[model samples]
Target: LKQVEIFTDGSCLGNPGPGGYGAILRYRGREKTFSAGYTRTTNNRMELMAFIVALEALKEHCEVILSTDSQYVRQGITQWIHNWKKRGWKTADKKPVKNVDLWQRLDAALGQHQIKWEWVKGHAGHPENERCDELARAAAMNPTLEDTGYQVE
Candidate 1:
């Protein structure tokens, strides 16, 4: 096993218009970045997916510190996962969980590796976090063909 630290971020040009997520995985002095965009989506969804890509990029199960600025994601994993599961994927109001499909996939990915969830305030001076912002922004700014049959899970 190796030690990998991931800095992830997601940005939506208009909160619901063009959206993208970025993640950087670094271990053993090597680094790789991942990013993708959707024609339409929310920042939270991309944020969740960013970590998914980062963990999935690993070749082996490893201890990982995943840092992100999305409160939804950090708190979801830290505070909401059990409740959501116990509530049968419903919100506190019993509403269906937002992005349930993505959440489910992210949860599974987590099970395959050791992870530490960390949160950072957006727009802070963290360089890796800022680079993730740039990557996500670039993806959101560029329009690309979307695969209609694709879903994160």
Candidate 2:
């Protein structure tokens, strides 16, 4: 199977304001980068979206190494999701999971790939991470669509 390295980042102008996500997929000597913007969303949502989009871009099962700067993404998927699923997508306190919509999409996107998740420090001068940040920030500044799933709560 092909092995791919993916780097992703999310940006929000304000917690619930304009947001965007960027991702880059690298295989062999080729790279593909993509991003999207939303008029209203959260940083966490954007973070999740970044990974989801990257994973979904795969045409078939492959070995994936995904890197991101969000512990919320890393820990939530690696540690928290099992329990959340066991509890019917509820928290330990039984509250509905905060980004259930995106989480479900992410879970589905996991599909047939073997994924290894890595956490990187944001704004730490890493080349790919920095480029993703630039893409996300630029996208957020020019958001063209609404985040229909965004709830005011």
Candidate 1 displacement at residue 96 in angstroms: 2.5
TM-score of 2: 0.91
- Scored by TM-score, the top model is 2
Query: Which lDDT values do the candidates have, in the order given?
Result: 0.80, 0.86
Question: Candidate 1 residues 1-153, lDDT tens each?
Answer: 266899888888564577888888897789898988778777777788788888887777888887677788868878989989998999888877878888888898899888876677857678999999899888888746352323342
Residue range with the least summed lDDT across 10 consecutive positions in model 1: 144-153
Least lDDT summed over 10 consecutive residues: which range in candidate 2?
117-126
113, model 1: CA deviation in Å? 1.2
TM-score of each: 0.85, 0.91
RMSD of each: 3.3, 1.9
Q: What's model 1's lDDT at 81?
A: 90
Estimate the lDDT of model 1.
0.80
lDDT by residue for model 2 over 26-127, one digit each (tens)?
966789898999999999999988888888888888899877778888888779889888899998778888998899889988866898877777566679
